[model samples]
Target: DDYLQHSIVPTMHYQDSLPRLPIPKLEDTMKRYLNAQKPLLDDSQFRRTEALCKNFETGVGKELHAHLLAQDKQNKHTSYISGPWFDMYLTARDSIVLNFNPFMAFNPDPKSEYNDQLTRATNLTVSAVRFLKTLQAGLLEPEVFHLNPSKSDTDAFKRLIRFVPPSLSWYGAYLVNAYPLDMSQYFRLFNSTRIPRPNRDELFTDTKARHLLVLRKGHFYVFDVLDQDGNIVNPLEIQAHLKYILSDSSPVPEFPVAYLTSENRDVWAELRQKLIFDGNEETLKKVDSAVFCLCLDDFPMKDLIHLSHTMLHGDGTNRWFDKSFNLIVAEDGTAAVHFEHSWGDGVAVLRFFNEVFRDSTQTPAITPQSQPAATNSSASVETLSFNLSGALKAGITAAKEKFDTTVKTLSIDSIQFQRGGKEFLKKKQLSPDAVAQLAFQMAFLRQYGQTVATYESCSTAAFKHGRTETIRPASIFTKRCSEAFVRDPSKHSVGELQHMMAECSKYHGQLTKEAAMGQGFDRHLYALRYLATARGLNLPELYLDPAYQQMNHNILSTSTLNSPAVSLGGFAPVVPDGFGIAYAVHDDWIGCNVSSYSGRNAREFLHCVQKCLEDIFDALEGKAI
Candidate 1:
């Protein structure tokens, strides 16, 4: 009877009282972290790491670990590493890795006739507004977004609150390593008040908003969906406004103001710091005040994975990586969102989008009536201009140049394995996520000719203020499977492949359980190592050890997000030489989107994944799990 509790922190304010993140046992974490590296590290390296671990148990690690416990007691509302981790993530100049800022590529929906670009973006925004209203009221049907609520607490069903992610109502601000999500900071997407008074700041007039910022063909504009009272404007008015904005003039081809958002976080922050001194308040305020931003892309995408490239890292000119949510709409009906992960993970974003898309795409029972029948002309958009001197423009050039170099080193690719997907694997008595993971192992071996480390994001949002935990999917069983197959050019005999496939899935299932229970090694180790720095103690040898670096350098950093809307999610790799991989499995087919840095070719790695799936097909008549 104690199998579950359907409710998780049901209310927005409930998280304030939930338990702080706990400190795992030092010994247990030590053993688990070592275990993670064993399948990858050689004995000499492993032994040195083991020695370091033992030293950590007796050395400065003891003092740092002790201090963390006290701090954990002191801070009951947040994790022990929350502050330090925030500093590192927000302060580091080179911290905006693609690994952290992930993007979701929603599979095209034929349910809605989003034939034109403006119509597509406008409808998406309308649905999003409805979702915002629901979130603000805390009326989300529990269990719609995340994994089913746990059975451990039967009482939770009646209360029904847990794992609700941050919504549009709570505005987030970037304060240069100062604080996380301080709501007092009012940053709007682009609120234009047509009722202008003389010489007054644009900050105060009709500031309350429910609008979407539109970036089309490399220019930025605002589409205000709210009136003076901050209420929803009529749908017809929204469309008419978008139509006019669509017909408006664009800036000179070189003025890519939106590109500033795509630069490295620190660089963006630095430029933002400079903006306070360099640009007029009006030009700067419009970009900063938004709840979220939307990009109405010009590319009428035709394919599934093709939409992913543009959504995640659009032709560079059309994307901004800093905003909390950069919802992208394509002319071909493909819709997606590029998320600044520092705001939160993909679960909430995915949840919100999936619900909105599913509900919004459905045909409405009654269309709205005509309003006051007033004739509307142009959109409430302001052409923001910056007073840039030679020095300021020079700095902007430098930032873009660096971004260009960084971008050239990155690649994004998409793949579809049509042979079989979730249903096929399930019918084979295997976990679909596990099978996709195994397929990745084979792909890595085929591409790099070596067994490399991997990262799989397992959701831990079941607990209070839950984030994700790393579950290493590559195992010794995976190695043997790939080695034997690659060794003979002999593709593992059908029987061997089947056995290994089963092993892989079962292990993945086990890790999935462990991670949900808050038993993964990565975060446990991360907390300990980072706690050392927080306490002003030198990092333990365990962190500096060769084994530590080797195991953590994930070449295939992957995650499985099963969403009805998202075809495949993609992000930059954690390490320079790695691939950030996000995938989804449908009943009929699976789509995998891979992004690489360190100069690797994303298409090449995607091809490797394709070849591996094809090999599986040839071996078992395209019916093998």
Candidate 2:
């Protein structure tokens, strides 16, 4: 009844006051586009691309930009890029397993006793329900990144912020150099599922459902985590029910229905129709509407590499990959969150992950020696059995075959560069992220003798209902610096090479800032091209240019998130020949989890990345190569 008494800042106080995403001016976008294309293109290719871009700006592009502005004006409630961005993800036909799903493994509890599978799962489940209740009650703290914590993250700041009107609260936070991200996506964190359709997928949520879906040994079970009064169930009962499932003696299904969720969208959509036709609609709804899924694996995590594989795509049949997120715990007690990406980004999931970890470890409701409630826990849990027809059974088998065949072609590897990290880069007066990006450039060039298109994801969450924008990290500065060192280090002095490295860092930092502010050329150009397609207009030459195709290919798809709550996160390569790079720069070490298809060498790429970083560090120390 007194939510305000508990909330630091109400969950959505700044949503109404957040700014709208801006469309970059055509000239500026063209300039950025040319800059990105220059390093990877020869003179003729560059000239052709430049001409096509200019033609686009002066001709159809102006009309397209005008239409976009009108559309944005009519749709003032959300960002102009929101609809297209959703379409971009939902329309893809690829399987979400390695293509779209990503995993973030939680760091093990400091208290090893709490790491027991039963203890941790119970605590995590209880803590997760608590997070849900807190959010639904509007008592969860609003997400804010304080640029100056002393000024903005203090109780004095909270005292004043509490009085500001909801519509004006964002400005109050902004005045203190704090940014409150758009929280519209948080509603999907619970009781949500992504429904597959013919060509596109739909996100479905049932806020009324109170059950939790549990998957183990290819079987599904559900139990109530919340009572009718909307309060969390007793922790002991939660433990008792989870313990019951962990001890389930059911044999693994010959045709695990969860594998259908791993199939191609079109195939899954058809199979779902057959499933409903065969009298499984109610059961399907139960799976879709239940609160987020919790998957209990029968095996233990062997290592980080194995952990990544297990979390990313677990045996295919034991996981329902369409759930908004799945909390997977292994027999060894190690756990991680594998999530579907269409409904939200890492920001929402990471916040939830951090809070759950903090609450479970710091204020756990159960302990190592805690006993289950004195109740018939098995009686409270119900197993969901799908009445699969012959066609549906065939579909599940096919999905399993496809999943194994696809994942078999992929490889994952990781490295922790102990030579230096964020502290060392800051000491050298270089941008850590910039240096990281440059290291990729140096590594790719040193290994393959060419600079290709690279993608670094930057969030535009400061705006209303914003998504992500791409930061093209490969630049002329990186190209020149990389060639100088890799091609002929004897020609350039250490000071000259160091100066070039600084230039690359400065330029990359500027690019990062621009992309975060919604000024990058990639999304702007993408939206224009999308508008043309939507309008059935003739294809713009700029969109058809080979250079444009190359830029969009994104051979090095990279994203970074540094959080104490996340041990690592990963995705598969967007293209067959590309590498999916997820990296973090800790205080004294740099770590990366990279994955690729068999066509590319993931292990060799990581080796080159480590060597390039050492070379960069040597240059920083004024050591000659």
Candidate 3:
């Protein structure tokens, strides 16, 4: 059915016509930046910052913006932020473990029998291969956002847009209120790895590789999942190999090389260089070139918190952090996809996550009756080995120590606010995302008696090679609204407070739309800063201002993704004293999986968030204040 539909309008049909990311005017950015900072800065601090902003806008900002425009004009092939954004990630020396990698867990299969570790992993692998084949064949449906799918996501719409040339297909879809997103990042979803280096990392891809990398008991295994002609290997054969690995009684390795990937990029790069010198070049190449990784774990997730820890960053063994993504299934059959972030955003990864879950659940390629092909399992499956020198062994030990110490300091907690969710918000004509952001604002205020900078990721995928833009949720409106409800609920009438929240909802809606449209100031300012440094100029006073630094700190870094396939997803905070919130507003309830370093109290923060949500729901019910 998918092939038949996509046969009309093939994937990449609208890539040629998507607009280039725009560089917002300097005045607009400064105004937006000032407004974004107003809530976080006091009157006196803001006065100094405001002067710096004015100075920079009239001075260095204009020069940087002009140079950035010329460079962007010359490089029409990609967005202005792509190079700098990639550089920002690749050049960061921090280990990707707690900083760059994130995980989104798959919802348990409706059919309980199918949730068995071996069965689910087998089906997931098969579905993944099918997705790859369809994508490579250009038969995967193009991703589009329809204002009203009943009108725009139809065969008639597809028929009309299919005939439109690639260069005009975007406008053609736009006329019907349909928006086609850029699929440029989707190419990095498979057969790719992030290779570590001293100061920067490189993205490596080998699409021709046909093997699947599997890790269990801190041991590496690989088997061909595709035939010589690139056809998916038989399901039985794949199942047999996986079953063999799972049943093996091998003890955990004393020095698992996978831990090195959890080390700082420079540390990992040094060890990797040494391992290559120890005659493991071809062995490492096989690990890097495999289609993707599948990690079969021996422990069951005890609960949501356990799952978050298990999926986000495991025990520094039995997982490869550098693979494009690792399909991990635990002993209890729970699974999640942990991915490296520098290559792409959630847009591409979520698309794959959603599709794989849907395909595996609705149209599984294997069943309980499915039998593994009779073969010499020990002969067919190959174990990957690394020849480690004494120094390399010591390197692994040091890496493991660092990984354990860092992850030990992390705290994660969750809240499932069953009172209300998107369905209830829609009935009130309030944006669900706005309410979610408001809940965070209120929670922080309730917990700490203060509001801080908040970051909400908004995809700018509507343009060619687009990345993400910041939706600064810590706005004046949220602050005022939160203060009214949290600090002095009795000071304002329930109706007045509700009205204030309504204003926040409206403004947040507008902010979201602007960020999605690439009209937000964050990336524009970020690009100018990046360009100024690239040209060897002294830092602008605006960038040097304390307010500017604070705004970028993002104490409440948050992102929301709601999908039927995902049970929950999470990441660690960007800073030690900050919180990383992954929230989803479902039909009847809302869920949040929040993480923070030991300096912050994740449990109390979640408690405040839950109470704040209850407060908001009560106000909607006309009971608060």
Candidate 4:
């Protein structure tokens, strides 16, 4: 107990000793915010933004700033705008699910060798249970990565979760980040899921939730994979059930209810009430409270990018987005996970999957069953049918078209840069992520000729209740570096390019510091804007200012994750014109998920990133491109 207490470092409170997020001086915040706008604005536009910012400093901005300061005193343990920021998250325009709730899907047959179909599912399922149990025991290793090791502090050690970290999400216009603080839902981590009920969305999980619902051919069935004692059933037993499901994997003609999840939450809310109202609620709960869902995909996975779209938003019939996450196992036994982002950011899930991958790959011995169980015992999936009114049914049918359209429009590309990794930067004694970050910038500049708003998720997990703050990758320095590379890399002397790299790397480091401090520039200004609305005050001039809007307008939304042990990534583009690009930086390679809306070509954008890396490599070699 003593060793566990001392050695088991709980990360939920890791940053408790650190100072609470300080309210950055209004002037300092204004300074940073204005700097962010510099790259995106024209000279005249820049002057206007600057003048408005100056006026804001002297007038109503002062009052709002003062309010934030006073609130910071009262909210000493949290960011001053945490309250209003969180409130707005839920109640704001429901565009969140489609644009913000990112999805993570694992690469199929990562080991690149086929084990038996049932055995693969058992392996993944077993590893997942290990992850769930660890979270419950609070003994899972916490995420602790330093973006730049020499420039910061970090580590990952096993510890009790102690209490669920303060996280936030929307169930309509309310905060439910505290869902885990209550042990009930925490225990149902696997079985429980979200049900967007009438007024407040409900979190429901049955205690006897030993099976998962499998959707095949547009119909749902229950597949019981756990033994009586709750451990994953043997491969033989599970395999037979898989065979049974494959026997009839066809969809009934119905609304892809899953599409509603792809729309704004407000639209979904209206559609939800009509279908599962009142007496029909019991069956709805049965499906919602299942241990998570499994899509019994009849077809084998074609590729990682397509599979991601499948797991995140399949043909729209086979998922329930409100589930903490969903598991889809292909007919061949390959599997993927699609998580609901509102419960927590990808950082939380990344930590969870890293642990699972670590254990599962060690290859635990699968105990053979004496004989395959009867299909009755193995396949216990409930045939849950919603009693939908004609109007609601029509709504769902339309939702199918919407989902098909959304996924249809998404051009997601996977960049598996197997030849390069940490070695690429370390070889030149540069910051580890410098190459990738610079490459991303150069790619955008070459293709688009200018930079747009870019956001990379930065961890504030060091704060007791911290989640993430925006790390604006599109900065003055990176834009300059990329501009030079695009203008004509050969024209610049080697010394000039090296200096550019150093400057951009240092700037990225500073953004990391601000994110760690919890005063992300974008959000502070955003919170101030929301605070005005929340207080019934007129829209703050700063937010209404055009420069502020343009600078924060997301175009190339990208996040690079160092999930070293897993071939895992997630996706969501903050804007239709942009692409949501997430990268997995490993020892010898970079795995990236690049996504674009219908009009933009993900393939071309990925090619741009590839070319940028190639150019930087050429620079490393002292060769002219």
For each candidate in the order shown, give its overall lDDT on alpha carbons: 0.62, 0.90, 0.89, 0.63
lDDT score of residue 113 within candidate 1 = 47
lDDT per residue for candidate 4 within 1-625, as digits (tens), equals 1011122534233333333555667788788887877788889988888888888888877887788778777776665544554444445445444565566554444554433455555556656765654555556433444344433222221222333343321111012111111121134357766555333444456757666666666666666655686566665566566556666634555554555555556667777666666356676666676667766666676878766676556676666667777766666665667766544555566665565555555653242232445667433545666666787777777767666666677777788777667877777766656567778878888887877887777766544445567887777888888888888776798778877887887888778778767766766776667667768988867778777777666787777766545455657677778888877667777777888887567788788888887777677667776
Would you estimate the TM-scores of all the predictions?
Answer: 0.83, 0.98, 0.98, 0.84
lDDT (Cα) of model 4 = 0.63
Global Cα lDDT for candidate 3: 0.89
**1 versus 3: better TM-score goes to:** 3
Residue 536 miss distance in model 1 (angstroms): 1.8
RMSD from true fold, candidate 4:
6.4
List the RMSD of every prediction in angstroms: 8.1, 1.5, 1.3, 6.4
Clashes of each: 17, 0, 0, 10
Candidate 3 residue spans exceeding 4 A from truth: 1-7
Residue 458 deviation, candidate 2, in Å? 0.5
TM-score of 3: 0.98
lDDT of 2 by residue, 554-600 (tens): 89999998788788988899899999999998999999899999888
**Models ranked on lDDT:** 2, 3, 4, 1
Better of 1 and 4 by TM-score: 4
Give per-residue lDDT, candidate 4, residue 530.
Answer: 66
- lDDT per residue, candidate 3, 76-191, as tens digits? 98999999999988998899997989999999889998988889899998888888887888888898888989999998888888899998899998888888999998788888
